[PDB]
Structures are given as structure tokens and as C-alpha cells.
Amino acid sequence: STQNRRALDLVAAKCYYYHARVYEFLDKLDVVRSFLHARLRTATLRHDADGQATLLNLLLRNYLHYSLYDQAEKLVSKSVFPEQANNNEWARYLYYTGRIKAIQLEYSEARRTMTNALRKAPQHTAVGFKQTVHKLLIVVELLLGEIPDRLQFRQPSLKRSLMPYFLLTQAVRTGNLAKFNQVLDQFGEKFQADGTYTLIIRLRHNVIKTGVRMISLSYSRISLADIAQKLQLDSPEDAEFI
Amino acid sequence: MITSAAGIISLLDEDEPQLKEFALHKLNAVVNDFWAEISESVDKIEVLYEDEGFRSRQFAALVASKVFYHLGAFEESLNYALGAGDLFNVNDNSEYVETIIAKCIDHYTKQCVENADLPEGEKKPIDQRLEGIVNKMFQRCLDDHKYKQAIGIALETRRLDVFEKTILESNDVPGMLAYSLKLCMSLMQNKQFRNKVLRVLVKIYMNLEKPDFINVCQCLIFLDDPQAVSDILEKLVKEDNLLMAYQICFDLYESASQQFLSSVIQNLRTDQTLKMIKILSGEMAIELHLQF
Amino acid sequence: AVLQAATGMYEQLKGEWNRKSPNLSKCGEELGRLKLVLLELNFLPTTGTKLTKQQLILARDILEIGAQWSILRKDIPSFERYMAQLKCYYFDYKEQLPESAYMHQLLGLNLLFLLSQNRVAEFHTELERLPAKDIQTNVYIKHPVSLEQYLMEGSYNKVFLAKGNIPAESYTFFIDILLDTIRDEIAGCIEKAYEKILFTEATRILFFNTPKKMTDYAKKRGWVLGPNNYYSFASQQQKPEDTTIPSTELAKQVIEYARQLEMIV
Amino acid sequence: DLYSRYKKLQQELEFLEVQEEYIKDEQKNLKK
Amino acid sequence: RGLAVGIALVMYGRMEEADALIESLCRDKDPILRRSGMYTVAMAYCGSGNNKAIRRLLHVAVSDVNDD
Amino acid sequence: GSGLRQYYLSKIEELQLIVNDKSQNLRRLQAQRNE
């Protein structure tokens, strides 16, 4: 903080990362927000691209750890991430921004960011980061009405971790409320511990949406009582509004 | 804590002025941490400064300046920093104070540079609050004995008054004069202002206890003032310091145009004056050269 | 001294509001005078350390009655003002403060409030502030979140059924505000869904009680009634207009390709 | 020397713009 | 050829007061008068280091029809 | 105990980053021209 060297900023960026890490295991994460914000202005005014990228990522992780999704959105709206940043810092930024967009119903921009975060992720290490981004991208792609890639569930690293989401993706794809609710009642606790439960709940609309899409794609004229049966809705009157 | 400033910001649209004042005293403590959300509520905090009757309208300007400083809109940030008036303490070591100070000087410099070449009647008046802070900024170098730094900003902001003042109050006047002269020709590419710098540089040379006349004539060739050169030389004969004018003339012939020297001869006419034009006409200087 | 006076003042607001016929404007003056006193007693403490908990416990209450009083007289800005301050005392200083009994009730009102004003993006953000467990268990939180899903999937039958099974009497105001929006949304589907629907057929679709309530709404929506008690919705003729080639837009795009091939040098 | 360094850098920056403008111009005519 | 050198010396050390003449000479269809503009830039901007003048000389050097 | 030493250095370091960017870019352009 006292020194103003130019090469030290590259060292400083790593120090700030571990400074948030020691408090991460201290479970405070709040006294660092003032330090991170104050140091971010010090880096931004000096055009310290390396420090500014790390400081912005750590703040987003700080905000997202406490579900301060409103606070984190404001910061990313005004602050500009360094274009000449490390690919490892671009990967975190694209994930953190993509997670924010997913909560704010900006699914289309979320999908692009997490896909970019996956691309910029290290090719041989950072398995855990790949898992977390894959888990959120599967939900967003399902939340966007698209279909997740079948290949990612086949990888040895992601196979066990993406299994609850593989069953959930299957339930959404067939577009039946009965199978979607079974996954939720079976893997609800896993999704909650995963930070993806709230985005899973909105998938009920997508299950109905894609189920209706298959109904029109297949039936030239279908009874509303039949539609209620194929979507496992409550009454044909409910299928009438849907 | 205080993870969301929505509650504090919510204390801004109440009709009780006391309620608003307390919220402002709460925002400034968290403006360095929660500026992102206040940035979407600035329009509710600049109206407080816009209101004339508000008790803390000067405080409202200061906090809005902090939000804009964090936001990066430095042009808007300084405009409210000047609105803070006395509450924007130039003596503070805070990053916000020093960053707005830098933006103020640059903004003042651009106006003065634009104002320098403008005609007098079209000269846009620089704001008094903007001039007052830079004058305190200029005084800091004089207080801190950083005379070379104060010389440069004086040239950038085209203020010859502070430029003149810095050289005189400086401990090493001859050294500062030489440093200023070297900058005046090597770095200044605006002739109309470079002449003004030399027009005051000649004044300091005149008011020196031992007037170093040699550099004066060099500066006067740049200014193209034969009348000044003839006058300073004519009084030199009256003051009996014939040695200096003898050296002065060889410097005129070496580094001045013949039209400049020709105009000096006529003024010299209007014994020793006859030998004086002998060097200026140059038929002596080539004689020593040819003899060399 | 000041804290004791404020606590005594709070009960007289508590006593008047608790009565079966609360005195709104006469509570409002008490409310306005109470917020000024809280200002001296560390209102919204910045980075609240181990200070006195009585002020923290107190200031949370006047906002709780304050937020609940705003909907009693049915004004929007007052509720946002009080709930925004109240949210600070719910999540920030929760290490010192205990879990408020009315906290989940008032948080659900805020969530249902955002739905009534269609600020659905803000609805999910404030929803993340609550733990994932009590979203699916707490009745005061389950009702708004399930109503958002019902609105999104089109379960307009359950949206109107949400009136009956509200979790508490405080939720009534925001439900009607939502139901006014639902009425236009239901009929908005009908113009694009039904090519003709019978007069009393749309009575239950629009959830209209008296047939007269259709007549005023019909002219407001400009529905040309037919002789056979049918509404003719022939409006799909305004297709995406594939009849026109967007030549300027296409010429703009093809030129850009040529630019990305030649301008590079 | 603090002002001189600032001004020397300013001229060096401005010269870099001149050099980078002439290189692009030369590349256009070298292709010709 | 003699005039081209002569025209430049008329406006020696004249700084920006030779802008009107220089642009007239540089746009001329005569190759020699275009050469006079180059010399005029040299004399009008001698020792000034004017990057605007250097910008003009470099432009003509790399993009001109006459090698002289 | 300084005047605009912080202000000057802020201006100087801002130019140095800009200068370094253009010198890197110019050397790329010069190599393209030389080839």
C-alpha cells in the first residue's frame, strides 16, 4: 500500500488474491471488502491492469459469497474489466458476471460468458472451476430453452459431479412436470449446497415451455385434456391458460 | 456490515431537512465502499446541492464529487469538488483529494492554454473556485521549496505571475533562471507565449543585483527588440562598464541577423559608440576569424 | 436517557397500532416523530460493532410497524422507504440481532411488492438474500415465489386463487395490484390465442364476476363484439411482414463482410 | 528535472504518432 | 530550380506564417514547385522540431509522384 | 515534503504506459513495412 512501484503491482495482484484467501478460511470476508474497494481505486487510477483485474474478481467473489447479487451487478455495470488481463482472471470474471446475469434473468448474456469462461479456463488444471461453471451453464442453457451438450457429462472429471444435473437435464428435455419434480425432490439438497437451487426452480416454466413445443411440433390438432396429460398439468382449464 | 446503502439513500427524499443531512453524513463514510449503488442515486443528491436553502448543500456537493471520482467521471467529479468549497481540504492526504487536485490542474491548464491564444474579448472567465485551489497548489511548492516543479506548472498554465514569483523567491535565482531559459527554448513551441516568458525573464535579469547583461542580449535577439539592445548597450557606455558591452557586441554579431544588427546601428547613432558599431558591423569579428 | 425515552415512545406507537382499529394518520405523526429520535440513537449503524443492542432491537421494530403501516394507507413510496431501511436490520447486523418473528412476513411482502410492479429482475435478486432452505419451507416466502412461477408459466387460474391462500392479512394489498396486471395479461393472450371466443366463455377466463364488468373492459380493450356473442380477433394478418425484403439491412451486412476482407490492410 | 521528464515524454509520445502515421502511409505506397 | 530554393529562403524561420504558401506549393502540379514546398517547410520550420511539418515531409517522401 | 511531485509522476507514468504501447505497436508496424 505504501509503495508505488510498477513491477510490484504484478506481485501485488497475487498478494491480494491470497489476502482474500486467508480471510476466506477465517469466514469473515467482510473486512476485506473495504480493503479490496480501496485498493481497487489505487489500482484503477494508476492503470494497474493486473491488480485491477484481480481486485475486481475478488470483490465479485466477496459479493457473491453473501448473495449480494444487487451490489455485484452495480460494480460490474460501472467498473471496466481490464482487456489486457490474465486469461485466468478473465475466466473468473466471465463466470462471476455470468452468475450475476443468470440471477438477473439475463440468460442469453449469461450463456455466452460462462462458455467464454470455460474456454479461457486452464486446459489441464482447475478441474473444480470447470465443474462449477459447467453446473451453472447447464442450468442457463436449460433456462434458455436450449439443450446442454451431451459430451460434457462423459468426461471423467465431470461425470460424478454433473450426474444430478444430467438427470435434471433429462427431465427438462422430455418436458413433463412429473419427472422434473422427481429430480427436485431427489437432488434439491445437492442443488442448494451447489448454489444453483434458485435457478433450478425457474426450470419448471421451461419444462412446460418445451413440453408445449413438442406438442405443437407433433400434433396438428390435439385436445386440451390430452395436453394436460402429456404435460401432467392439473386440469385442462390450466392447460388452456398455459 | 451495511451491505446495502438503499436504506441510507432512502433517507434522501424525505421532506425533513434534518433527515437528509444525517444520510449525507452516513453516505460519505461508505462512499469509498458502496459508490456503485449511490451512483444510481446521484440525481437525488445533486438536487440537494442544487437547492440553495439546504443547510448541507456544500456537503452534498462533496459526497457527489466522491461518487463521481470513484465512477471515473472526473469532469463531473471536480465540478462538485469545487462546489464543496471549504469542505474540500487541499491539505488532506486522501487519494480522492490528490486525484481531484490533479484533475483540477489539468482542467485549469487546458482552459488557460485555450484562453492564452484567444482574444481578450472572447476570453472565457476561469472560475474563481478553480483558480483558488490551483493558487493554493502553487503556494505548496513555494512552501515546500520545490521551485523547479512550480516553474513547470506555471508555464503549462500560462501564468507569468507565479512564474516570476517562483524565480525570485527561489534560493538559487541564477540557477533557476538558467533552468527556465533552457526550458523556454527547448520545450516551448508557442512563440507568442515563449516571448512572454522571455519578456518577464528580461525583467528579472534587469532587477538582479549584478545585472547579467550577456543573457539579456541573447533573449532580446529572440524577442527581436533592437531598441532594447541598443538602449541597454548605450547606458552601458555611460555606466563605464565598457568591458561588458565589448563582450556583448561579439555575442550580437555571432548569433543575430544583420537586419537586427542594422537596426541597432541606427539607434546607436540617434568615440566609444564608433568603436561599438565596429564590432556590430562585423568587419572586426571576421578579422579575428580570418586571422585565426 | 434518550434510549429510555425512545423505547417508551415506541410502545405508545406499538399500543396504538396493535389495537383492532389502528389510527393511521395519528400513527403517521408518531411515526414521523419516531424516526427523528432514532437518528441520534445510531440509526443504520455503519459497520455495527458490539454497541448497545437495545437501539438495534428497537430501531428494527419501528421499521416493522412502519413498513406494515405503509400498506395500511396503500401508498407505494412509503413502503419502499421503510422496507429498504428494514432490510438493513434484517441481513447486516444479524450477528447481534436475533431472528425477528415478523422478518419472513415482511420480506415476503417486499417480494410480492416487486411482482405487483413487474420488477421481476429485482424480485430474484432480493430472493437470493434469503437462504435456499426457507424459500421452499417458509409460508411467507413460498407464496410469493410460487406466484412468480405461476405468473411466468401462465397459471393464471392459480394467480387468482392466490388471493384465498395468502399467508397473512398483510399481503392483501399487493395481490390486488398484481391482479389488475393479470387481467390485461390474460386478455392479451386471447387476442393472439383465440380466433373467436364466446361472450360468457371469457367470463371465467377473465375472472369477471358480473357480465357488466365485461362491457366497460371491452371498449377499453376495443373488442369488436359479434352478433353471435363472439369476439372476432382477426389480427394475425399483421404478420412479421416477410412480404418486404430488408434490402438496406442486407446490403449493410454484405458491405461489412467486404470491409472485413479488404479494410484489414 | 521533473517537468523536463514530463515534457520530454510528451514530445516522445507525439513523435511516436508521427512515426506510426508515416509507416502506415508508406505501407500503402509500398503495396503500390 | 533556382526559384524553388529562392522561395523557401523568403519565408525562412517564419514558423506558421508560411502555412499559406506551403500548402499552395505542395498542391502544385509542377514537380519543382512541389519541391519548393519541401524546402519552404525546412526553412520555415528550421530547428523548431514541429511534428506537423515533419508529418508533411514524411507524407511526401513515401507518397509522391516525383523522386526529386 | 513534496509539491506536485505526486501530480507530475501521475502525468509521467500515464505517458510512459501510452508511450510503451505505441513503441510496441510501432515496432510491429515497422517490421510489417520492412518485410
Subunit partners of chain A (3 or more CB pairs within 8 A): B, C, F
Cell 512552501, residue located: B143
C127 touches A198 (CB < 8 A): yes
**Beta bridge partners of residue C196, listed in sequence order:** C232
- Which of B187, B194, B197 should be substituted to probe chain D, the one whose Cβ sees the most D Cβ atoms within 10 Å? B187
Phi-psi region of B158 (alpha: psi -120 to 50; beta: other; left: phi over 0): left
C16 touches C34 (CB < 8 A): no
CB contact under 8 A, F4 and B149: yes
CB contact under 8 A, C44 and B26: yes
Helix (H) or strand (E) holding C238: none
Q: Does F13 touch chain D (CB under 8 A)?
A: no
Q: Tell me the chain B residues in contact with residue C80 when contact means C-beta distances shorter than 8 Å.
A: 10
- Which of C92, C128, C148 should be substituted to probe chain A, the one whose Cβ sees the most A Cβ atoms within 10 Å? C128
Q: Is B44 exposed, middle or buried (0-12, 13-18, 19+ CB in 10 A)?
A: middle
Angle made by CA atoms A58, A59, A61, in degrees to the nearest 5: 65
Closest CA to A165 of A130, A119, A195, A200: A200
Positive or negative, the Cα torsion across B127, B128, B130, B131?
positive
Q: Tell me the chain F residues in contact with residue B146 when contact means C-beta distances shorter than 8 Å.
A: 2-5
E15 touches E48 (CB < 8 A): yes
- What's the rounded Cα separation, in Å, for the pair C185 and C191? 10
Q: What would the grid cell of residue A202 be?
A: 425457474
**Residues contacting C239, CB < 8 A, separation 6+:** none
- What's the rounded Cα separation, in Å, for the pair A130 and B91? 50
Which residue blocks in B172-254 are alpha helix, DSSP H?
173-186, 191-207, 213-223, 226-238, 242-254
Q: Determine the distance in angstroms separating the CA of B69 from the nearest CA of chain A, rounded to an integer.
A: 9
Helix (H) or strand (E) holding B271: none
The length of chain D in residues reads 32
Closest CA to C181 of C153, C203, C159: C159
**Beta bridge partners of residue C230, listed in sequence order:** C198
Q: How many CB pairs under 8 A join B and E?
A: 4
Q: Tell me the chain D residues in contact with residue E59 when contact means C-beta distances shorter than 8 Å.
A: 22, 25
DSSP for C147-172 reads HHHHHHHT-HHHHHHTTTT-SSGGGH
Do chains E and C meet with 3 or more Cβ pairs nearer than 8 Å?
Answer: no
Q: Determine the distance in angstroms separating the CA of C40 from the nearest CA of chain B, rounded to an integer.
A: 9
F28 touches D25 (CB < 8 A): no
- What's the rounded Cα separation, in Å, for the pair A62 and A202? 25
Q: Determine the distance in angstroms separating the CA of A42 from the nearest CA of chain C, rounded to an integer.
A: 23
Angle made by CA atoms B244, B245, B246, in degrees to the nearest 5: 85
- Per-residue CA distances from C105 to A97, B2, B157, C90, C120 (Å): 31, 22, 63, 12, 19
Cell 505501407, residue located: D27
- What's the rounded Cα separation, in Å, for the pair E52 and E56? 6
Closest CA to B2 of F16, C89, D29: C89
- What's the rounded Cα separation, in Å, for the pair B243 and B249? 10
Helix (H) or strand (E) holding C197: strand C196-198
Provide the 10 A C-beta neighbour count for residue B30.
19
CB contact under 8 A, D9 and F32: no
CB contact under 8 A, D13 and F19: yes
Cell 470483490, residue located: A59
Q: After which residues is chain C broken (C to N over 2.5 A)?
A: none
Distance between start and end Cα atoms, chain D = 46
Positive or negative, the Cα torsion across A149, A153, A157, A161?
positive
For residue E22, the one-letter residue type is: I
Q: Does B189 touch chain E (CB under 8 A)?
A: yes
For residue A108, the one-letter residue type is: S
Q: After which residues is chain B broken (C to N over 2.5 A)?
A: 270
Q: What would the grid cell of residue A160 be?
A: 460424478
Nearest residue of chain B to residue F8 (CA atoms): B149
Q: Does F5 touch chain B (CB under 8 A)?
A: yes
Q: How many CB pairs under 8 A join A and C?
A: 56
Helix (H) or strand (E) holding C196: strand C196-198
Q: What would the grid cell of residue B191 be?
A: 512563440
Q: Give the side-chain half-sphere CA count within 13 A for E5.
A: 2
Distance between start and end Cα atoms, chain B = 87
- What's the rounded Cα separation, in Å, for the pair D19 and A145? 53
3-state secondary structure chain A: CCCCCCCHHHHHHHHHHHHHHHHHCCCCCCHHHHHHHHHHHHHHHHCCHHHHHHHHHHHHHHHHHCCCHHHHHHHHHHCCCCCCCCHHHHHHHHHHHHHHHHHCCCHHHHHHHHHHHHHHCCCCCCHHHHHHHHHHHHHHHHHCCCCCCCHHHHCCCCCCCCHHHHHHHHHHHHCCHHHHHHHHHHHHHHHHHCCCHHHHHCHHHHHHHHHHHHHHHHCCCCCHHHHHHHHCCCCHHHHHHC
CB contact under 8 A, B183 and D7: yes
- What's the rounded Cα separation, in Å, for the pair B147 and B135? 14
Subunit partners of chain F (3 or more CB pairs within 8 A): A, B, D
Q: What would the grid cell of residue B138 be?
A: 502553487
Nearest residue of chain B to residue F1 (CA atoms): B144
**Three-class SS state of B90:** coil
Q: What are phi and psi of B152, to 5 degrees?
A: -65, -45
Chain E 4-43, residues with CB within 8 Å of chain B CB atoms? 15
Q: Does F1 touch chain B (CB under 8 A)?
A: yes
- What's the rounded Cα separation, in Å, for the pair C174 and C106? 12
3-state secondary structure C51-111: CCHHHHHHHHHHHHHHHHHHHHCCCHHHHHHHHHHHHHHHHCCCCCCCCCCCHHHHHHHHH
Q: Tell me the chain F residues in contact with residue A8 when contact means C-beta distances shorter than 8 Å.
A: none
Nearest residue of chain E to residue B191 (CA atoms): E15
Nearest residue of chain E to residue D27 (CA atoms): E62
A224 touches C193 (CB < 8 A): no
**Residues contacting C75, CB < 8 A, separation 6+:** none
C174 touches C113 (CB < 8 A): yes
Nearest-by-Cβ selection for A205 from C124, C125, C149? C149
Q: Does B188 touch chain D (CB under 8 A)?
A: no
E51 touches D18 (CB < 8 A): yes
E45 touches E53 (CB < 8 A): yes
Q: Determine the distance in angstroms separating the CA of F28 from the nearest CA of chain D, rounded to an integer.
A: 10
Q: What are phi and psi of B164, to 5 degrees?
A: -65, -40
Closest CA to B10 of B52, B38, B49: B38
C32 touches C69 (CB < 8 A): no
Biggest alpha carbon–alpha carbon distance for chain D: 46
What burial letters (b/e) apply to E9-18, b meaning 16+ CB within 10 Å? eebeebbeeb
What burial letters (b/e) apply to A79-93, b meaning 16+ CB within 10 Å? bebbeebbebbbbbb
Chain B 147-206, residues with CB within 8 Å of chain F CB atoms? 149-150, 152-153
Subunit partners of chain D (3 or more CB pairs within 8 A): B, E, F
Q: Give the side-chain half-sphere CA count within 13 A for A143.
A: 27
Q: What are phi and psi of A225, to 5 degrees?
A: -65, -35
Q: What are phi and psi of C196, to 5 degrees?
A: -170, 130
Provide the 10 A C-beta neighbour count for residue D15.
15
Closest CA to C117 of C67, C68, C175: C175
Closest CA to C226 of C189, C201, C192, C209: C201
Q: What would the grid cell of residue C252 be?
A: 449493410
Cell 451447489, residue located: A194
Q: Does B90 touch chain F (CB under 8 A)?
A: no
What burial letters (b/e) apply to B65-90, b meaning 16+ CB within 10 Å? bbbbbbbeebebbbbbbbbbeeebeb
- What's the rounded Cα separation, in Å, for the pair B163 and B205? 14
Q: Tell me the chain C residues in contact with residue A202 when contact means C-beta distances shorter than 8 Å.
A: 149, 152
Nearest-by-Cβ selection for F10 from B102, B141, B144? B102
Q: How many CB pairs under 8 A join D and F?
A: 41
Cell 548569433, residue located: B255
A136 touches A98 (CB < 8 A): yes
Angle made by CA atoms E36, E42, E44, in degrees to the nearest 5: 95
Nearest-by-Cβ selection for A238 from C120, C122, C155? C155
Q: Does D12 touch chain B (CB under 8 A)?
A: no
